[PDB]
Design a binder for this molecule. Structure first.
Ligand SMILES: Nc1ncnc2c1ncn2[C@@H]1O[C@H](CO)[C@@H](O)[C@H]1OP(=O)(O)O
Ligand SMILES: [Ca+2]
Length: 104
């Protein structure tokens, strides 16, 4: 069973925790990776009900289980805040353009 389903991708809570840890560390270091410079700020214009406060930041989560290191980020993301609290798992899959929907 998947703790989060993004389209056809299944993630366990460990896969979320591992990607969040990596992304938070780059945030603390003032560093980014990838042509699109992740982690970067996330603005919640779609109004997802995140129960943690912003600012929010997004970091790719990979279906492969590997930590994102540059290269294609795929469509899935972990969102965390300034206090390293998990806000949610969203994806561009099934959303028009560069918009998002939440993973279920
Ligand atoms: N797999 C993907 N599907 C849809 N949008 C993509 C995507 N990969 C990157 N993006 C979006 O492409 C745009 C320009 O790179 C950014 O808004 C970026 O959003 P993100 O960084 O929030 O994912
Ligand atoms: Ca996994």
């Amino acid at each position: 069973a998947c703790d989060y389903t993004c389209g056809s991708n299944c993630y366990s809570s460990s896969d979320v925790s591992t990607a969040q840890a990596a992304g938070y560390k780059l945030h603390e270091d003032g560093e980014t990776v990838g042509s699109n410079s992740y982690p970067h700020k996330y603005n919640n214009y779609e109004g997802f009900d995140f129960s943690v406060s912003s600012p929010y930041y997004e970091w790719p989560i990979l279906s492969s289980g590997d930590v994102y290191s540059g290269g294609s980020p795929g469509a899935d993301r972990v969102v965390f805040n300034e206090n390293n609290q998990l806000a949610g798992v969203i994806t561009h899959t099934g959303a028009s353009g560069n918009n998002f929907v939440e993973c279920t």
